[PDB]
Amino acid sequence: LKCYSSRTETMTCPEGEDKCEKYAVGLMHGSFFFIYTCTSKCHEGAYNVCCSTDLCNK
Amino acid sequence: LKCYSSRTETMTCPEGEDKCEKYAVGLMHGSFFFIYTCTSKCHEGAYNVCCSTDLCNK
Ligand SMILES: [Zn+2]
Ligand SMILES: [Zn+2]
């Protein structure tokens, strides 16, 4: 499985991490930033992206 | 297992994630910040922390 690991960067996930996710975190003063990663369990949230097809996390 | 999920919050990890980590993510122009999370596999990086005990990722 291949996932985005940032806005533009891409990697092959390590064993046991079968999902891509894209989730936002707070930065400062109401700004937010996206975190792109391979994972075994997706962070839950109302707008999180969680999927298992290549480069599906944006 | 329990980990920091940010600088000020903590959570009990979902079953299937038996590590805590703090790992570096780039922001802009050389600035960076840390992401705190449960994981099954730690992100590689010279500034990252990968551990297996309650709240160990700070
Ligand atoms: Zn400020
Ligand atoms: Zn700039």
Side-chain angles (χ1 to χ4, degrees), chain B residues 30-57:
Chain B
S31 67
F32 66 99
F33 71 129
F34 290 99
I35 283 294
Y36 297 85
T37 189
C38 298
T39 186
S40 304
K41 284 301 155 119
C42 290
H43 287 77
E44 286 165 345
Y47 300 88
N48 303 342
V49 178
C50 176
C51 46
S52 299
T53 61
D54 289 340
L55 302 197
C56 64
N57 56 334

PDB file of all heavy atoms in Angstrom, chain B residues 30-57:
ATOM      1  N   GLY B  30      11.668  25.616   7.225  1.00  0.00           N
ATOM      2  CA  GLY B  30      12.495  25.096   8.295  1.00  0.00           C
ATOM      3  C   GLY B  30      11.812  24.975   9.648  1.00  0.00           C
ATOM      4  O   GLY B  30      12.372  24.370  10.557  1.00  0.00           O
ATOM      5  N   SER B  31      10.616  25.531   9.816  1.00  0.00           N
ATOM      6  CA  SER B  31       9.927  25.315  11.083  1.00  0.00           C
ATOM      7  C   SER B  31       9.280  23.915  11.102  1.00  0.00           C
ATOM      8  O   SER B  31       8.951  23.358  10.050  1.00  0.00           O
ATOM      9  CB  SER B  31       8.912  26.424  11.364  1.00  0.00           C
ATOM     10  OG  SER B  31       7.834  26.393  10.446  1.00  0.00           O
ATOM     11  N   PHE B  32       9.124  23.339  12.294  1.00  0.00           N
ATOM     12  CA  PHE B  32       8.458  22.054  12.437  1.00  0.00           C
ATOM     13  C   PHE B  32       7.697  21.972  13.762  1.00  0.00           C
ATOM     14  O   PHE B  32       7.808  22.853  14.605  1.00  0.00           O
ATOM     15  CB  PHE B  32       9.468  20.903  12.329  1.00  0.00           C
ATOM     16  CG  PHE B  32      10.461  20.863  13.449  1.00  0.00           C
ATOM     17  CD1 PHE B  32      10.282  19.996  14.518  1.00  0.00           C
ATOM     18  CD2 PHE B  32      11.577  21.689  13.441  1.00  0.00           C
ATOM     19  CE1 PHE B  32      11.197  19.946  15.551  1.00  0.00           C
ATOM     20  CE2 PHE B  32      12.493  21.642  14.476  1.00  0.00           C
ATOM     21  CZ  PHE B  32      12.295  20.768  15.536  1.00  0.00           C
ATOM     22  N   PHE B  33       6.903  20.921  13.931  1.00  0.00           N
ATOM     23  CA  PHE B  33       6.232  20.684  15.207  1.00  0.00           C
ATOM     24  C   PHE B  33       6.046  19.189  15.389  1.00  0.00           C
ATOM     25  O   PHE B  33       6.347  18.401  14.489  1.00  0.00           O
ATOM     26  CB  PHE B  33       4.887  21.418  15.292  1.00  0.00           C
ATOM     27  CG  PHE B  33       3.810  20.844  14.402  1.00  0.00           C
ATOM     28  CD1 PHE B  33       2.566  20.533  14.924  1.00  0.00           C
ATOM     29  CD2 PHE B  33       4.028  20.647  13.040  1.00  0.00           C
ATOM     30  CE1 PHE B  33       1.564  20.013  14.109  1.00  0.00           C
ATOM     31  CE2 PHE B  33       3.023  20.120  12.221  1.00  0.00           C
ATOM     32  CZ  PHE B  33       1.800  19.807  12.760  1.00  0.00           C
ATOM     33  N   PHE B  34       5.589  18.785  16.562  1.00  0.00           N
ATOM     34  CA  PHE B  34       5.471  17.353  16.819  1.00  0.00           C
ATOM     35  C   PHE B  34       4.036  16.876  16.808  1.00  0.00           C
ATOM     36  O   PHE B  34       3.112  17.595  17.200  1.00  0.00           O
ATOM     37  CB  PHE B  34       6.108  16.985  18.141  1.00  0.00           C
ATOM     38  CG  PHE B  34       7.608  17.084  18.130  1.00  0.00           C
ATOM     39  CD1 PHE B  34       8.243  18.201  18.654  1.00  0.00           C
ATOM     40  CD2 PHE B  34       8.382  16.062  17.589  1.00  0.00           C
ATOM     41  CE1 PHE B  34       9.628  18.295  18.657  1.00  0.00           C
ATOM     42  CE2 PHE B  34       9.779  16.155  17.584  1.00  0.00           C
ATOM     43  CZ  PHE B  34      10.396  17.278  18.120  1.00  0.00           C
ATOM     44  N   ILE B  35       3.879  15.637  16.370  1.00  0.00           N
ATOM     45  CA  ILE B  35       2.606  14.965  16.387  1.00  0.00           C
ATOM     46  C   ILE B  35       2.725  13.878  17.439  1.00  0.00           C
ATOM     47  O   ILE B  35       3.713  13.137  17.472  1.00  0.00           O
ATOM     48  CB  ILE B  35       2.303  14.385  15.010  1.00  0.00           C
ATOM     49  CG1 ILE B  35       1.859  15.514  14.082  1.00  0.00           C
ATOM     50  CG2 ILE B  35       1.213  13.326  15.095  1.00  0.00           C
ATOM     51  CD1 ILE B  35       0.525  16.119  14.497  1.00  0.00           C
ATOM     52  N   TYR B  36       1.736  13.821  18.325  1.00  0.00           N
ATOM     53  CA  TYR B  36       1.716  12.844  19.405  1.00  0.00           C
ATOM     54  C   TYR B  36       0.608  11.862  19.110  1.00  0.00           C
ATOM     55  O   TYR B  36      -0.530  12.270  18.856  1.00  0.00           O
ATOM     56  CB  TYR B  36       1.406  13.544  20.725  1.00  0.00           C
ATOM     57  CG  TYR B  36       2.437  14.556  21.152  1.00  0.00           C
ATOM     58  CD1 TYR B  36       2.399  15.864  20.683  1.00  0.00           C
ATOM     59  CD2 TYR B  36       3.451  14.206  22.038  1.00  0.00           C
ATOM     60  CE1 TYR B  36       3.354  16.792  21.081  1.00  0.00           C
ATOM     61  CE2 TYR B  36       4.398  15.130  22.446  1.00  0.00           C
ATOM     62  CZ  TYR B  36       4.342  16.418  21.965  1.00  0.00           C
ATOM     63  OH  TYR B  36       5.284  17.335  22.371  1.00  0.00           O
ATOM     64  N   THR B  37       0.911  10.566  19.143  1.00  0.00           N
ATOM     65  CA  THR B  37      -0.096   9.582  18.754  1.00  0.00           C
ATOM     66  C   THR B  37       0.210   8.163  19.216  1.00  0.00           C
ATOM     67  O   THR B  37       1.350   7.819  19.527  1.00  0.00           O
ATOM     68  CB  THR B  37      -0.332   9.577  17.217  1.00  0.00           C
ATOM     69  OG1 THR B  37      -1.472   8.765  16.887  1.00  0.00           O
ATOM     70  CG2 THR B  37       0.901   9.056  16.467  1.00  0.00           C
ATOM     71  N   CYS B  38      -0.837   7.355  19.280  1.00  0.00           N
ATOM     72  CA  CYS B  38      -0.669   5.927  19.396  1.00  0.00           C
ATOM     73  C   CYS B  38      -0.273   5.438  18.014  1.00  0.00           C
ATOM     74  O   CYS B  38      -0.597   6.079  17.006  1.00  0.00           O
ATOM     75  CB  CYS B  38      -1.981   5.275  19.821  1.00  0.00           C
ATOM     76  SG  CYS B  38      -2.612   5.811  21.436  1.00  0.00           S
ATOM     77  N   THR B  39       0.410   4.300  17.956  1.00  0.00           N
ATOM     78  CA  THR B  39       0.782   3.722  16.666  1.00  0.00           C
ATOM     79  C   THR B  39       1.138   2.249  16.815  1.00  0.00           C
ATOM     80  O   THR B  39       1.378   1.770  17.925  1.00  0.00           O
ATOM     81  CB  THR B  39       1.974   4.465  16.052  1.00  0.00           C
ATOM     82  OG1 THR B  39       2.220   3.966  14.730  1.00  0.00           O
ATOM     83  CG2 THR B  39       3.216   4.277  16.905  1.00  0.00           C
ATOM     84  N   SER B  40       1.153   1.531  15.697  1.00  0.00           N
ATOM     85  CA  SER B  40       1.681   0.173  15.675  1.00  0.00           C
ATOM     86  C   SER B  40       3.121   0.210  15.182  1.00  0.00           C
ATOM     87  O   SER B  40       3.896  -0.717  15.414  1.00  0.00           O
ATOM     88  CB  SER B  40       0.863  -0.692  14.729  1.00  0.00           C
ATOM     89  OG  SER B  40      -0.494  -0.657  15.087  1.00  0.00           O
ATOM     90  N   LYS B  41       3.468   1.280  14.472  1.00  0.00           N
ATOM     91  CA  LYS B  41       4.803   1.417  13.904  1.00  0.00           C
ATOM     92  C   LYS B  41       5.240   2.858  13.953  1.00  0.00           C
ATOM     93  O   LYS B  41       4.538   3.749  13.479  1.00  0.00           O
ATOM     94  CB  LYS B  41       4.857   0.899  12.467  1.00  0.00           C
ATOM     95  CG  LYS B  41       4.866  -0.632  12.383  1.00  0.00           C
ATOM     96  CD  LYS B  41       6.070  -1.204  13.127  1.00  0.00           C
ATOM     97  CE  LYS B  41       5.805  -2.637  13.580  1.00  0.00           C
ATOM     98  NZ  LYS B  41       6.768  -3.591  12.960  1.00  0.00           N
ATOM     99  N   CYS B  42       6.400   3.086  14.543  1.00  0.00           N
ATOM    100  CA  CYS B  42       6.868   4.451  14.730  1.00  0.00           C
ATOM    101  C   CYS B  42       7.463   5.043  13.456  1.00  0.00           C
ATOM    102  O   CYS B  42       8.104   4.342  12.669  1.00  0.00           O
ATOM    103  CB  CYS B  42       7.862   4.503  15.879  1.00  0.00           C
ATOM    104  SG  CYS B  42       7.103   4.238  17.513  1.00  0.00           S
ATOM    105  N   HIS B  43       7.232   6.339  13.258  1.00  0.00           N
ATOM    106  CA  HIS B  43       7.828   7.080  12.160  1.00  0.00           C
ATOM    107  C   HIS B  43       9.327   7.208  12.380  1.00  0.00           C
ATOM    108  O   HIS B  43       9.772   7.512  13.495  1.00  0.00           O
ATOM    109  CB  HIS B  43       7.204   8.479  12.055  1.00  0.00           C
ATOM    110  CG  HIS B  43       5.806   8.476  11.515  1.00  0.00           C
ATOM    111  ND1 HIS B  43       4.713   8.106  12.272  1.00  0.00           N
ATOM    112  CD2 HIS B  43       5.323   8.791  10.290  1.00  0.00           C
ATOM    113  CE1 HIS B  43       3.618   8.200  11.536  1.00  0.00           C
ATOM    114  NE2 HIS B  43       3.960   8.618  10.330  1.00  0.00           N
ATOM    115  N   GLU B  44      10.100   6.988  11.320  1.00  0.00           N
ATOM    116  CA  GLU B  44      11.550   7.117  11.397  1.00  0.00           C
ATOM    117  C   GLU B  44      11.890   8.587  11.487  1.00  0.00           C
ATOM    118  O   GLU B  44      11.225   9.416  10.875  1.00  0.00           O
ATOM    119  CB  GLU B  44      12.221   6.526  10.155  1.00  0.00           C
ATOM    120  CG  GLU B  44      12.239   4.999  10.095  1.00  0.00           C
ATOM    121  CD  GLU B  44      12.581   4.493   8.699  1.00  0.00           C
ATOM    122  OE1 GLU B  44      12.510   5.310   7.750  1.00  0.00           O
ATOM    123  OE2 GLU B  44      12.914   3.292   8.550  1.00  0.00           O
ATOM    124  N   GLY B  45      12.927   8.914  12.250  1.00  0.00           N
ATOM    125  CA  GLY B  45      13.380  10.290  12.331  1.00  0.00           C
ATOM    126  C   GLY B  45      14.263  10.532  13.530  1.00  0.00           C
ATOM    127  O   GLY B  45      14.002  10.030  14.617  1.00  0.00           O
ATOM    128  N   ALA B  46      15.311  11.317  13.319  1.00  0.00           N
ATOM    129  CA  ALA B  46      16.328  11.554  14.340  1.00  0.00           C
ATOM    130  C   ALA B  46      15.828  12.325  15.568  1.00  0.00           C
ATOM    131  O   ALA B  46      16.525  12.374  16.584  1.00  0.00           O
ATOM    132  CB  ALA B  46      17.532  12.271  13.725  1.00  0.00           C
ATOM    133  N   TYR B  47      14.644  12.935  15.477  1.00  0.00           N
ATOM    134  CA  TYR B  47      14.117  13.714  16.594  1.00  0.00           C
ATOM    135  C   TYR B  47      12.892  13.069  17.216  1.00  0.00           C
ATOM    136  O   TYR B  47      12.297  13.604  18.150  1.00  0.00           O
ATOM    137  CB  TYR B  47      13.840  15.161  16.155  1.00  0.00           C
ATOM    138  CG  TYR B  47      15.107  15.804  15.665  1.00  0.00           C
ATOM    139  CD1 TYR B  47      15.499  15.689  14.334  1.00  0.00           C
ATOM    140  CD2 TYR B  47      15.962  16.448  16.550  1.00  0.00           C
ATOM    141  CE1 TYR B  47      16.703  16.247  13.888  1.00  0.00           C
ATOM    142  CE2 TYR B  47      17.160  16.998  16.119  1.00  0.00           C
ATOM    143  CZ  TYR B  47      17.525  16.896  14.787  1.00  0.00           C
ATOM    144  OH  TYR B  47      18.718  17.447  14.354  1.00  0.00           O
ATOM    145  N   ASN B  48      12.535  11.893  16.715  1.00  0.00           N
ATOM    146  CA  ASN B  48      11.309  11.225  17.146  1.00  0.00           C
ATOM    147  C   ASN B  48      11.489  10.363  18.385  1.00  0.00           C
ATOM    148  O   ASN B  48      12.597   9.923  18.688  1.00  0.00           O
ATOM    149  CB  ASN B  48      10.743  10.395  15.997  1.00  0.00           C
ATOM    150  CG  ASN B  48      10.479  11.231  14.759  1.00  0.00           C
ATOM    151  OD1 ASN B  48      10.403  12.462  14.829  1.00  0.00           O
ATOM    152  ND2 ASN B  48      10.331  10.568  13.622  1.00  0.00           N
ATOM    153  N   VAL B  49      10.379  10.122  19.085  1.00  0.00           N
ATOM    154  CA  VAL B  49      10.359   9.313  20.292  1.00  0.00           C
ATOM    155  C   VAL B  49       9.359   8.189  20.057  1.00  0.00           C
ATOM    156  O   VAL B  49       8.211   8.448  19.678  1.00  0.00           O
ATOM    157  CB  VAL B  49       9.915  10.149  21.500  1.00  0.00           C
ATOM    158  CG1 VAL B  49       9.847   9.288  22.749  1.00  0.00           C
ATOM    159  CG2 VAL B  49      10.870  11.328  21.710  1.00  0.00           C
ATOM    160  N   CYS B  50       9.812   6.950  20.233  1.00  0.00           N
ATOM    161  CA  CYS B  50       8.962   5.768  20.090  1.00  0.00           C
ATOM    162  C   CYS B  50       9.061   4.935  21.366  1.00  0.00           C
ATOM    163  O   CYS B  50      10.152   4.477  21.722  1.00  0.00           O
ATOM    164  CB  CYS B  50       9.425   4.935  18.884  1.00  0.00           C
ATOM    165  SG  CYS B  50       8.538   3.358  18.618  1.00  0.00           S
ATOM    166  N   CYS B  51       7.940   4.736  22.062  1.00  0.00           N
ATOM    167  CA  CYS B  51       7.978   4.032  23.356  1.00  0.00           C
ATOM    168  C   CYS B  51       6.732   3.181  23.607  1.00  0.00           C
ATOM    169  O   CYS B  51       5.806   3.204  22.796  1.00  0.00           O
ATOM    170  CB  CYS B  51       8.217   5.029  24.498  1.00  0.00           C
ATOM    171  SG  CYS B  51       7.205   6.511  24.387  1.00  0.00           S
ATOM    172  N   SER B  52       6.710   2.426  24.713  1.00  0.00           N
ATOM    173  CA  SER B  52       5.622   1.463  24.954  1.00  0.00           C
ATOM    174  C   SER B  52       4.991   1.516  26.341  1.00  0.00           C
ATOM    175  O   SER B  52       4.368   0.544  26.759  1.00  0.00           O
ATOM    176  CB  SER B  52       6.104   0.019  24.729  1.00  0.00           C
ATOM    177  OG  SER B  52       6.545  -0.193  23.406  1.00  0.00           O
ATOM    178  N   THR B  53       5.151   2.612  27.068  1.00  0.00           N
ATOM    179  CA  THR B  53       4.528   2.704  28.396  1.00  0.00           C
ATOM    180  C   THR B  53       3.624   3.938  28.506  1.00  0.00           C
ATOM    181  O   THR B  53       3.766   4.880  27.719  1.00  0.00           O
ATOM    182  CB  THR B  53       5.579   2.703  29.528  1.00  0.00           C
ATOM    183  OG1 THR B  53       6.438   3.842  29.382  1.00  0.00           O
ATOM    184  CG2 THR B  53       6.415   1.425  29.483  1.00  0.00           C
ATOM    185  N   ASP B  54       2.704   3.936  29.475  1.00  0.00           N
ATOM    186  CA  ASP B  54       1.700   5.006  29.580  1.00  0.00           C
ATOM    187  C   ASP B  54       2.317   6.405  29.587  1.00  0.00           C
ATOM    188  O   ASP B  54       3.224   6.685  30.371  1.00  0.00           O
ATOM    189  CB  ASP B  54       0.836   4.842  30.833  1.00  0.00           C
ATOM    190  CG  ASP B  54      -0.129   3.678  30.739  1.00  0.00           C
ATOM    191  OD1 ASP B  54      -0.433   3.220  29.610  1.00  0.00           O
ATOM    192  OD2 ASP B  54      -0.593   3.237  31.808  1.00  0.00           O
ATOM    193  N   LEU B  55       1.821   7.247  28.686  1.00  0.00           N
ATOM    194  CA  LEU B  55       2.196   8.661  28.561  1.00  0.00           C
ATOM    195  C   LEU B  55       3.682   8.891  28.302  1.00  0.00           C
ATOM    196  O   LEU B  55       4.196   9.982  28.546  1.00  0.00           O
ATOM    197  CB  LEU B  55       1.731   9.467  29.778  1.00  0.00           C
ATOM    198  CG  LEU B  55       0.232   9.451  30.103  1.00  0.00           C
ATOM    199  CD1 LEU B  55      -0.114  10.597  31.057  1.00  0.00           C
ATOM    200  CD2 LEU B  55      -0.638   9.503  28.842  1.00  0.00           C
ATOM    201  N   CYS B  56       4.366   7.876  27.781  1.00  0.00           N
ATOM    202  CA  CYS B  56       5.815   7.985  27.580  1.00  0.00           C
ATOM    203  C   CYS B  56       6.240   8.977  26.485  1.00  0.00           C
ATOM    204  O   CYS B  56       7.406   9.382  26.437  1.00  0.00           O
ATOM    205  CB  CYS B  56       6.414   6.613  27.290  1.00  0.00           C
ATOM    206  SG  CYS B  56       5.830   5.871  25.737  1.00  0.00           S
ATOM    207  N   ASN B  57       5.317   9.356  25.600  1.00  0.00           N
ATOM    208  CA  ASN B  57       5.677  10.222  24.483  1.00  0.00           C
ATOM    209  C   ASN B  57       5.627  11.701  24.844  1.00  0.00           C
ATOM    210  O   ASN B  57       5.238  12.532  24.022  1.00  0.00           O
ATOM    211  CB  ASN B  57       4.831   9.934  23.240  1.00  0.00           C
ATOM    212  CG  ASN B  57       3.357  10.033  23.508  1.00  0.00           C
ATOM    213  OD1 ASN B  57       2.904   9.844  24.646  1.00  0.00           O
ATOM    214  ND2 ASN B  57       2.587  10.338  22.462  1.00  0.00           N
TER     215      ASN B  57
END
